[PDB]
């Protein structure tokens, strides 16, 4: 015997904060691994026209 | 004790399954780019 | 509202239930809640089963408490507590019939 | 029959043409799409007309002659009298003119383009591209009264429906206890009614201005045509608000029958969706950033616009709620519906990337538009349309639609048609303008992944033509074997098979538990709610 | 009793036969459209179809409106809701027709709000010679503002029960709106600027051109209102094609008080 | 003055609705003559209007 | 339709005892209503110089 | 710039107006990737986990302590999203102290540029159209639809400023490299200010539909140096 | 090394479209030459601007309608 309660409200917060974290793995990679990656190069080639003197 | 191990055997192969399902639903531009650069 | 006022609601509306119909809409609505049904009401649902003369909503109840029970270490802690009221009533399980 | 006033069979009408239409809409955007195959005009011979022809030909049987005639005819003319509980529509006789001038509509769009010049204007008919002294035949003059014959249908078609609702009702029914369809509806009238009366001097301005030479927007005597770009799409976002809420209708039955259990937050989502109708008339120059509007005014709709998806956001997490202690029932209907919540929101992504002033001038009148619009038509209004006519075909025709075969028709219609507008988004964002017979070589890339997907999702057109046959032909052989699904509410748990025969219909709507078909008169007697 | 109650309809709302004119209107309206595209462009020759397609499609409507009146008197579904419809129904239908005033007023203040450059910097303009309202435009508010006090003083006179006020009532409102055709007249044939006078030639026969295009039909509804009231058609408790005239005059003083401000007051 | 006159005639008439009325023969058939003019002669002019021949 | 609320009945088809057979008179109401394009690509096409 | 065949990205930021845009096309993203990732997952959490749930929680329906919070959640992320919205339009209407003024007119078929600004010294406009070379005269190399016969040359690091209209049909002007987009309305006239910070060409399209010859319609531009670009102004 | 000059902010027209700034600078030029004529230094200012951020085309049609009399705005100052 024992008063077991919540096994809904156990499966939304466990719900929503894993997709949250999934939410992050898709975009802290996309802006980094792909937005800062893309600023690489642009702030490498625009420094490849400023040693031109 | 029993949320700790239940909880978690349901969903080690779902998020295993579910990036499956973007990498087609999404990423199927990644593919036919990779097959014909002609 | 709490877990005593389930047990106590509906474990009175399985008294006047004086039909197969009021044992089945009510034996749903005591199962269809976030919550778990204490072994209490569950004995007035097999009573209920008793009183109208019908053994598989008796088996029934046994397999929606196998599958909403959460945990099998807290289904045969559970199903020995019962095992008291369904040995009188002769009530099976559905595994042990093999349909 | 021809002109009986009985709602029930102009709604029958309603559908036999919005299918008609569609094998139009759709033939046109067959060629259109075989036109942007490779570079160089292939099939049309070199004629850059008849292609501004043939995408404002499709653009409008698709808008105004598939989506306005079912959402709000062909389902409002048969819900509307049914699930409120009257026995037809207020307005009876008037409910057939409201059908009878579409084909009217037709004739004086079909005749639009077999005439000599051909209206090459775009769905968006623009004053100066539309002037006589650039298309100079009546090609255009009939294509700006065929959007007036429908213009004034869907306005007395929804004058039927504020004197329905709001009078017309049973006994119980109180004004906070409304099926959501017909609080889709009912929300919708007051879009149809306060934004076709602007449309009316929009189109009519632009007639004086063609052949009685008036100039309201003639630029020889000062009158913009840039008027015209804040007076037609002060209709337009209304307009594209009026084909998704009747679409929020649907769904909203739809995904809490086949999940057994009610509807997340009743009262919070009729709210929340007057809330669109009446914030979606606050914004309609979103449209219009690149024109030149001030940079306060573009500053207010880029905060503006973003607001409409506030109560959108109650509307998706709320059918995310719906659905998440319940059962799943997967049936057809269910299938659509549950795309629906990933393929219109996507389109929604869409949208408040494309809602700030601050980058929209940077994809403006490019493919990235037409990849965000199409999710919410083609994804969002058709996905909404194949859920309400799978939904209630075998309740009002009488006859189930093989089960069987309408699932490979939902998923060659959800990845055939996502092959054709995901990657528009990526044409876009390059830069590839739109209306274009031929395009620069680096545009053959994509534009050819979006052309082997337009004969996917008209290949399962093609089978959906067979399942509207075999289910009028063989459509009662089908419940009596194992063809299709007969019950959409398969009983509970606990609840017995023999006893499920007495109570068989558990609906929350007057709809199922009619006849099937229902009656000439299903409501004789007033019926009495709680 | 019950053998007459199953005789009878038990639901108030009305129920209509199955009547050809919902698709006689709609040729009409087909051959209104599809004809005035032609003759703007030849392939015919002469401008008549035009009047052709006004006179097929008006005797429609009173063809339509001979079934309504012999519902309206001589078989008569209206209870105390279906009187609601309609009242209802024309009620909220004058809220879209005095939104297409806010489709000509917005061009008003698209031309007039900001100067614009292909005119002068000044509204009206120069060459352009407008009307002050110090003239017979405002014999135009006076005239209406009498009969804003005469048709609400036979509206309760009809209800009054003596027919010395109702019926003479409603003949003296009805020729001082075709007096009012043609004070709308003088201007359509003594004002200086045209309908092709640029865009304020465009606009001004636009806002006050609607407001002339309603009288034509204002002046028809009340030629039925009197042919009914002397041929004992209608009633002084249920009056349906009297009530939605009123009402297509009380919301008459409010759209040109607010045409009246601003093409006139603040358009000099 | 016909108010009671005309319904004894429209009610229990047994016909349609707009066959009703007693003055109502002649209401139809010279209305359908130029019901049976209006709407063939707008699109016998269609394929004069394919060739370009105007007027 | 006034009358008679059966299966059939409420369609202005005639499904069910047609003289000819039903997918000639069906198909031919939804491939008439596909090939009104293919006429406007041919009488401005041929109107036009192409062929 | 050039666009290149199966690409998914913007054209290559030549312009800081142009790479403000790429900042705040990723700055958007960015929150929309957490949006579509929770709707991807709360939507495979559900189809995939409760279609075999047979006992529905018929129960639960108004939720009040969770009505309240995704009401502010988009209440939450758009008013953070909006300052970098702000930043941006306020910062690109930057004509305070412009250096040249070069027009672009564009009569239906073809653009119509003068450098009326008069530093040449022979005192007069050089005004040139640009049509599109068609496939006739196409010399063996040229990109099609894409590569007019008559050019475009502005300097380079110069705060220069567009005046944009047309005598005709609207059709605007669009260069993705730069990120200038005005409509070329026929009554009136519009601005736009882009910097270049780099030497090569530009190729754009026009968007705006402007009847048959919509494809026929190009805008080429090259930056080169400013001693470089006086070479061709004193010749014309 | 700059040797580049044209037409600065113009505070009065600071929004995108500036064709009022080419009409009133065509106004301010034209009604100074008729007006107040002592010098042109400060009466190209706006001769200068005009010329800068205007067509060809209209400057055609603004000495067109100046001939025959029918210019819409203002050109006589005196
Ligand atoms: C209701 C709106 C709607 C719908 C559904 C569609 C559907 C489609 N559209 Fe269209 N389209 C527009 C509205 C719509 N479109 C508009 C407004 C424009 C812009 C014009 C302009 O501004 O220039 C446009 C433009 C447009 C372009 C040109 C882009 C540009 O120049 O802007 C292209 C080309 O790819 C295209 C293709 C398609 C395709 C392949 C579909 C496919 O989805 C169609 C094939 C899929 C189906 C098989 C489903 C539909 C079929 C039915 C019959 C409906 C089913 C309903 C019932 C039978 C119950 N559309
Ligand atoms: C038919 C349906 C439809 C719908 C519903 C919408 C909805 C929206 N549309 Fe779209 N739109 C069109 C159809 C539609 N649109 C058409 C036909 C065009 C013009 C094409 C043409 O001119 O030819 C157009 C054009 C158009 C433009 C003009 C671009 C251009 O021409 O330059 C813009 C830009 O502002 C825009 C934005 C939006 C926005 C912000 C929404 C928003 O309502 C959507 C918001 C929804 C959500 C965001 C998703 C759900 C919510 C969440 C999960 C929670 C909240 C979200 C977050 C916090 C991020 N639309
Ligand atoms: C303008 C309008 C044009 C309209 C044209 C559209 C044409 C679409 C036609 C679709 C169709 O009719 O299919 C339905 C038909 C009946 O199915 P049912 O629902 O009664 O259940 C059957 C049972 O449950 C399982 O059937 P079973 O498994 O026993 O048969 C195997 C079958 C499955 O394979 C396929 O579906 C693809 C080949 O394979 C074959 O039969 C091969 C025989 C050569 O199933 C079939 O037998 C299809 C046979 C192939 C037909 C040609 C396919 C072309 C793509
Ligand atoms: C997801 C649902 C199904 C998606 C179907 C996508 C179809 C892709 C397609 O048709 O791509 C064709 C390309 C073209 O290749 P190309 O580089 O243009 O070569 C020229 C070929 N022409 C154009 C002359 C004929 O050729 C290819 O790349 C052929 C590769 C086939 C890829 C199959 C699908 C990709 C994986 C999806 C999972
Ligand atoms: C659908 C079918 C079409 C429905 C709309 C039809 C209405 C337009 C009809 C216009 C017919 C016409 O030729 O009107 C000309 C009139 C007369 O203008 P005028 O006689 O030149 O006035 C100048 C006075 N002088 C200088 C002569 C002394 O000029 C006017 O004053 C025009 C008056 C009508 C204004 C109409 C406004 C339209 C708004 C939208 C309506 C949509 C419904
Ligand atoms: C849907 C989820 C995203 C991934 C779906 C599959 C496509 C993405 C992987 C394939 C791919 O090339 O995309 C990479 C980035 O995608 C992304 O970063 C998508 C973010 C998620 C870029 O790949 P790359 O490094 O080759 O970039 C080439 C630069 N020229
Ligand atoms: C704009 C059209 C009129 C808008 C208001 C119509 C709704 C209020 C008037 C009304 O109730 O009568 C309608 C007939 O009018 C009509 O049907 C006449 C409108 C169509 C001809 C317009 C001619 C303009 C000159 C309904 O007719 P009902 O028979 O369904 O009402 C059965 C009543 N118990
Ligand atoms: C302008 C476009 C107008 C569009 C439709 C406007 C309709 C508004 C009135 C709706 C009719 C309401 C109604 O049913 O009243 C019945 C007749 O009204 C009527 O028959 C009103 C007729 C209006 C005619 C004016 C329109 C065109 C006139 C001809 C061309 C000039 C009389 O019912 P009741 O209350 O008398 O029943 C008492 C029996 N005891
Ligand atoms: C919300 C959803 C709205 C739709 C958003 C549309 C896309 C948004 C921009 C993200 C694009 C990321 C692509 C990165 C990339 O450069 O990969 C390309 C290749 O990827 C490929 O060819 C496969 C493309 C897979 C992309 C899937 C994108 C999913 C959205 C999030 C990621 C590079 O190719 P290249 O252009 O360098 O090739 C040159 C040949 N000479
Ligand atoms: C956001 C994106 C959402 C996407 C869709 C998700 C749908 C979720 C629906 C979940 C059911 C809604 C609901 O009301 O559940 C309540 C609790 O859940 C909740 O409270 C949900 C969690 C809310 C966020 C966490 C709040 C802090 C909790 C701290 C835990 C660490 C149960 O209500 P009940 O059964 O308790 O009511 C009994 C009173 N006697
Ligand atoms: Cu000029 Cu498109
Ligand atoms: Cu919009």
């Known amino acids: 015997i024992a008063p077991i309660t919540g096994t809904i409200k156990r499966r939304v917060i466990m719900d929503i904060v894993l997709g949250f974290s999934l939410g992050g793995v898709m975009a802290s990679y996309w802006w980094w691994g792909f937005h800062m990656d893309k600023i690489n190069k642009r702030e490498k080639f625009y420094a490849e026209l400023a040693e031109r003197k | 004790e029993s949320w700790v191990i239940t909880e978690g055997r349901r969903l080690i192969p779902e998020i295993f399954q579910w990036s499956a399902v973007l990498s087609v639903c999404l990423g199927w531009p990644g593919a036919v780019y990779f097959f014909s650069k002609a | 509202e709490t877990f005593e006022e389930f047990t106590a609601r509906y474990e009175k509306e399985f008294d006047e239930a004086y039909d197969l119909f009021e044992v089945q809409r009510v034996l749903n609505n005591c199962f269809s809640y976030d919550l778990v049904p204490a072994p209490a009401v569950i004995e007035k649902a097999l009573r209920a089963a008793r009183r109208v003369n019908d053994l598989p909503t008796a088996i029934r109840v046994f397999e929606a408490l196998k599958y909403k029970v959460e945990n099998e270490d807290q289904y045969k802690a559970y199903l020995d507590e019962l095992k008291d009221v369904r040995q009188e009533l002769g009530v099976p399980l559905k595994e042990e019939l093999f349909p | 029959w021809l002109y009986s006033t009985n709602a029930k069979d102009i709604a029958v009408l309603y559908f036999m043409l919005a299918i008609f239409s569609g094998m139009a809409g759709t033939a046109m955007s067959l060629i259109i799409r075989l036109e942007l195959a490779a570079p160089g005009s292939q099939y049309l011979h070199g004629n850059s007309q008849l292609f501004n022809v043939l995408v404002v030909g499709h653009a409008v049987l698709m808008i105004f002659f598939l989506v306005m005639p079912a959402l709000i005819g062909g389902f409002g003319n048969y819900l509307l009298p049914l699930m409120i509980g009257a026995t037809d529509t207020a307005f009876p006789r008037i409910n057939n003119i409201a059908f009878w001038v579409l084909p009217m509509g037709l004739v004086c769009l079909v005749t639009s383009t077999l005439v000599e010049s051909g209206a090459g204007t775009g769905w968006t008919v623009y004053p100066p591209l539309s002037s006589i002294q650039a298309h100079s035949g009546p090609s255009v003059d009939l294509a700006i009264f065929a959007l007036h014959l429908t213009s004034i249908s869907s306005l007395l078609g929804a004058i039927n429906f504020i004197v329905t609702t709001l009078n017309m009702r049973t006994n119980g029914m109180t004004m906070h206890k409304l099926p959501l369809f017909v609080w889709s509806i009912f929300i919708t009238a007051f879009l149809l009614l306060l934004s076709l009366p602007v449309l009316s001097a929009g189109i009519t301005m632009l007639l004086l201005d063609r052949n009685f030479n008036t100039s309201f927007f003639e630029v020889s005597g000062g009158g913009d045509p840039i008027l015209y770009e804040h007076l037609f799409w002060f209709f337009g976002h209304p307009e594209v608000y009026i084909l998704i809420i009747p679409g929020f209708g649907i769904i909203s039955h739809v995904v809490s029958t086949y999940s057994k259990k009610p509807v997340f937050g009743e009262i919070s989502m009729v709210y929340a969706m007057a809330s669109i109708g009446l914030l979606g008339f606050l914004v309609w120059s979103h449209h219009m950033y690149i024109v030149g509007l001030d940079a306060d005014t573009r500053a207010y709709f880029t905060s503006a616009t973003m607001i409409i998806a506030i109560p959108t956001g109650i509307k998706i997490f709320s059918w995310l709620a719906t659905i998440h202690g319940g059962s799943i029932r997967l049936a057809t209907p269910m299938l659509y519906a549950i795309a629906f919540l990933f393929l219109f929101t996507m389109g929604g992504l869409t949208g408040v990337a494309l809602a700030n002033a601050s980058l929209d001038v940077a994809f403006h009148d490019t493919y990235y538009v037409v990849g965000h619009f199409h999710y919410v038509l083609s994804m969002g209004a058709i996905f909404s349309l194949f859920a309400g006519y799978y939904y209630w075909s075998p309740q009002i025709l009488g006859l189930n639609y093989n089960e069987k075969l309408a699932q490979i028709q939902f998923w060659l219609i959800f990845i055939g048609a996502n092959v054709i507008f995901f990657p528009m988004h990526f044409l876009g964002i390059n830069g590839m303008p739109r209306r274009i017979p031929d395009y620069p070589d680096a545009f053959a890339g994509w534009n050819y992944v979006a052309s082997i997907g337009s004969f996917i999702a008209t290949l399962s057109l093609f089978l959906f033509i067979y399942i509207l046959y075999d289910q009028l032909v063989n459509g009662l052989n089908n419940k009596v074997n194992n063809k299709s699904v007969i019950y959409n509410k398969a009983p509970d748990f606990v609840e017995s098979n023999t006893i499920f025969n007495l109570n068989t219909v558990k609906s929350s709507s007057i709809e199922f538990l009619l006849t099937s078909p229902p009656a000439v008169h299903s409501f004789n007697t007033p019926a009495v709610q709680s | 009793t019950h053998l007459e109650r199953s005789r009878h309809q038990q639901h108030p709302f009305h129920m209509v036969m199955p009547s050809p004119w919902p698709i006689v209107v709609s040729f009409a309206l087909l051959s209104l459209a599809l004809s005035t595209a032609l003759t703007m462009h030849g392939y015919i020759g002469n401008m008549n179809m035009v009047y052709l397609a006004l006179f097929v499609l008006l005797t429609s409507s009173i063809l339509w409106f001979r079934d309504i009146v012999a519902e309206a008197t001589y078989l008569g579904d209206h209870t105390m809701a279906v009187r609601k419809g309609i009242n209802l129904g024309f009620l909220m239908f004058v809220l879209s027709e005095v939104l297409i005033f806010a489709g000509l007023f917005w061009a008003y203040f698209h031309s007039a709000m900001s100067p614009d450059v292909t005119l002068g910097a000044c509204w009206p303009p120069v060459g352009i010679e407008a009307v002050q309202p110090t003239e017979l435009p405002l014999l135009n508010t006076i005239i209406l503002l009498s009969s804003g006090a005469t048709v609400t003083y036979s509206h309760h006179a009809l209800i009054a029960g003596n027919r010395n006020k109702a019926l003479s009532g409603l003949l003296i409102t009805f020729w001082l709106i075709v007096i009012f055709v043609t004070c709308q007249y003088i201007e359509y044939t003594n004002a200086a600027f045209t309908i092709s006078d640029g865009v304020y030639g465009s606009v001004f026969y636009a806002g006050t051109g609607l407001h002339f295009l309603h009288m034509v039909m204002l002046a028809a509804m009340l030629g039925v209102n009197y042919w009914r009231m002397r041929n004992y058609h209608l009633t002084a408790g249920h009056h349906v094609g009297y009530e939605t005239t009123i009402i297509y005059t009380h919301v008459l003083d409010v759209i040109w008080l607010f045409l009246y401000v601003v093409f006139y007051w603040w358009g000099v | 003055n016909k108010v009671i006159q005309l319904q004894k005639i429209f009610q229990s008439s047994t016909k349609p609705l707009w066959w009703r009325h007693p003055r109502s023969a002649l209401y139809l058939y010279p209305f359908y003559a130029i019901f049976a003019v209006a709407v063939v002669t707008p699109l016998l002019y269609i394929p004069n209007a394919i060739r370009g021949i105007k007027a | 339709v006034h009358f008679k609320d059966g299966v059939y009945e409420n369609i202005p088809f005639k499904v069910k005892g047609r003289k000819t057979p039903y997918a000639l008179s069906h198909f031919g109401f939804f491939a008439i209503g596909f090939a009104v394009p293919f006429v406007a690509c041919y009488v401005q096409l041929k109107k036009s110089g192409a062929f | ?236 | 090394n700059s040797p580049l000059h044209t037409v600065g902010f113009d505070a009065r027209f600071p929004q995108q479209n500036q064709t009022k700034h080419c009409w009133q600078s065509y106004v301010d030029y034209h009604k100074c030459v008729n007006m107040k004529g002592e010098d042109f230094a400060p009466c190209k200012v706006f001769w200068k601007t005009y010329n800068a951020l205007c067509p060809l085309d209209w400057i055609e049609k603004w000495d067109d309608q100046r001939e025959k009399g029918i210019f819409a705005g203002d050109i006589n100052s005196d």
């Open chain 8, 1 to 236: 710039d050039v666009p290149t065949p199966y690409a998914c990205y913007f054209q290559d930021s030549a312009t800081p107006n142009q790479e403000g845009i790429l900042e705040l096309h990723d700055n958007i993203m960015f929150y929309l990737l957490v949006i579509l990732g929770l709707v991807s997952w709360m939507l495979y959490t559900i189809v995939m986990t409760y279609s075999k749930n047979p006992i529905a929680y018929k129960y639960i329906k108004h939720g009040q302590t969770i009505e309240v919070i995704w009401t502010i959640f988009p209440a939450v992320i758009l008013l953070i999203i909006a300052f970098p919205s702000f930043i941006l339009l306020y910062l690109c209407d930057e004509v305070i102290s412009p250096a040249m003024t070069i027009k672009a007119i564009g009569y239906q078929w073809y653009w119509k540029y003068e450098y009326s600004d008069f530093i040449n010294d022979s005192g007069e406009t050089v005004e040139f159209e640009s049509y599109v070379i068609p496939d006739e005269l196409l010399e063996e190399g040229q990109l099609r639809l894409l590569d007019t016969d008559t050019s475009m040359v502005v300097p380079v690091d110069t705060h220069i400023r567009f005046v944009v209209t047309a005598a005709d049909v609207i059709h605007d002007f669009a260069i993705p490299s730069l990120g200038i987009k005005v409509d070329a309305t026929p009554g009136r006239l519009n601005q736009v200010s882009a910097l270049i910070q780099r030497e090569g060409v530009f190729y754009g399209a026009c968007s705006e539909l402007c009847g048959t010859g919509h494809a026929n319609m190009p805008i080429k531009i090259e930056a080169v140096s400013l001693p470089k670009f006086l070479e061709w102004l004193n010749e014309q």
